[PDB]
Design a protein around this ligand. Sequence first.
Ligand SMILES: Nc1ncnc2c1ncn2[C@@H]1O[C@H](COP(=O)(O)OP(=O)(O)O)[C@@H](O)[C@H]1O
Ligand SMILES: O=C(CCOc1ccc(F)cc1)N1CCSCC1
Ligand SMILES: [Mg+2]
Ligand SMILES: [Mg+2]
Length: 265
Amino acid sequence: QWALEDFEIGRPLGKGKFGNVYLAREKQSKFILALKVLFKAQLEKAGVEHQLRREVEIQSHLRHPNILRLYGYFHDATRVYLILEYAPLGTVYRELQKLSKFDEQRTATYITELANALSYCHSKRVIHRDIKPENLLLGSAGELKIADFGWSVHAPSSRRTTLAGTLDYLPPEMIEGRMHDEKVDLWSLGVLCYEFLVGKPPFEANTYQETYKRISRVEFTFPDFVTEGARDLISRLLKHNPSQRPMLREVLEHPWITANSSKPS
Ligand SMILES: Nc1ncnc2c1ncn2[C@@H]1O[C@H](COP(=O)(O)OP(=O)(O)O)[C@@H](O)[C@H]1O
Ligand SMILES: O=C(CCOc1ccc(F)cc1)N1CCSCC1
Ligand SMILES: [Mg+2]
Ligand SMILES: [Mg+2]
């Protein structure tokens, strides 16, 4: 159906391991969107054809205001092209680098929007497994949208692919290569809540090897400015034992969240 001929390309929106994402406009409708380009040679070298297929399948079928739309795809013998909803206000990552830390109202509102989108995903037994600030995008009203479903699956599961980059958002079961389920996304939600309030993730270290140690032992401490409510929520999410982590309803209903968030469930 669609091909490159149908689009005018504009400025680079961002880079990923395989993906280079561009602003684009469809010629006959003037529709503005984002075009994620992947090189077939690199996809093959790394052998991640199955991840791409999962990304397209899972994401095109989901419909939620806090999840980024995927409309379609095409290819041309060197490249694959994913047609995405354009997010005009950029990444949460960029916003965090701009402001250094978020206040309690900003943080709690972002956490509600995430918890809503994840609740919807988990109701289809879909788990994301790569929740982090560079994969969270911002819509025209500043609302958070989850993106990049390249690592997502159906539960239960093991990991059949090599972990490439940062260990910082992964739970112990996942880095130790054990079987995992839905609870992995709740751990990452706790990591994120800490990084939003503090300015850096709670297990950050200088080497892979020591980050791995700090995660498996759950070694983290709070700066003085983190309030008692925030500590309570974060301490509940960052539990070594997956089954002791709360349900998403408990996160949405937590007193600190209800007091500080400016959006509902
Ligand atoms: N729909 C979009 N709107 C605006 N910017 C985007 C969009 N999708 C991706 N980006 C930018 O491009 C980057 C990489 O996209 P992503 O889909 O996460 O690629 P990868 O799978 O390689 O990580 C993002 O971190 C973001 O900066
Ligand atoms: O040449 C192909 C098949 C056609 O492109 C598709 C793209 C996405 C998809 F979900 C299904 C098909 N590939 C390139 C190497 S990775 C697998 C896909
Ligand atoms: Mg990404
Ligand atoms: Mg990806």
